[PDB]
Write a protein that binds this ligand. Structure first.
Ligand code: MOO
Length: 231
């Protein structure tokens, strides 16, 4: 048959490699749809036919669970990640530490801070939480360059349309055109976690085979290579 995976945008590269490998060794076609975790959860709620859902936060998985769209016994935290600040590869921007007294205004210099839309994209929600805890939010809000998902934010920095952008550590590994210039302290935000679950009514042997593969060694190898931490 064919499996349909709805996965957070930050999983783009890893999921494509995993799908390729699974087809080589098991013969099944895996089709992935990538977007903000919020967008995917709402599509699943509406009735879009996804078999698996992997969210970049617990919030949007909880959302789908409440709408009775998830086979709950299958829900499990699969990956972890870090929150970082990236700059264009060829930028002269130097490394910096992030604390209560970081001078964001000087760092930006009339430029905007690329972020996933803090209204709903997990990467933006983690970022807003961190910036509010570090007291930088009030200063930064009028200087944001929001995007549809974390990869949209990444693109803004790669195309040098924003001096800095807040993305996941894994995004930096996948990107050929940016560099990590700072890392948020773990205590500034909720732990970045990626729950996976089978969509209600799609728990059959074919989907289950893929779900099990995601927790196996071949997949763990690919996830690690892309900067994700395995839970
Ligand atoms: O759902 Mo994302 O990976 O925070 O854009």
């Amino acid at each position: 048959g064919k499996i349909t995976v709805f996965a957070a945008a930050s999983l783009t590269n890893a999921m494509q490699d995993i799908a390729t490998q699974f087809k080589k060794e098991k013969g099944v076609d895996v089709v992935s749809s990538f977007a903000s975790s919020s967008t995917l959860a709402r599509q699943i709620e509406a009735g879009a036919p996804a078999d698996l859902f992997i969210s970049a936060d617990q919030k949007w998985m909880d959302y789908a669970v409440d709408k009775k769209a998830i086979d709950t016994a299958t829900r499990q935290t699969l990956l972890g990640n870090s929150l970082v600040v990236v700059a264009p590869k060829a930028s002269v921007q130097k490394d910096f530490t992030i604390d209560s007294k970081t001078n964001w205004t000087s760092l930006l210099n009339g430029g905007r801070l690329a972020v996933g839309d803090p209204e709903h994209v997990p990467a933006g929600i983690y970022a807003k939480e961190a910036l509010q805890k570090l007291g930088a939010w009030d200063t930064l809000s009028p200087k944001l360059a929001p995007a549809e998902d974390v990869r949209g934010a990444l693109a803004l920095v790669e195309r040098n349309e924003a001096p800095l952008g807040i993305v996941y550590g894994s995004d930096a590994v996948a990107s050929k055109g940016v560099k990590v210039v700072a890392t948020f302290p773990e205590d500034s935000h909720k732990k970045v976690e990626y729950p996976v679950a089978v969509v209600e009514g799609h728990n059959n042997a074919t989907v289950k085979a893929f779900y099990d593969y995601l927790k196996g060694p071949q997949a763990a190898e690919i996830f690690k290579r892309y900067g994700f931490t395995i839970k």
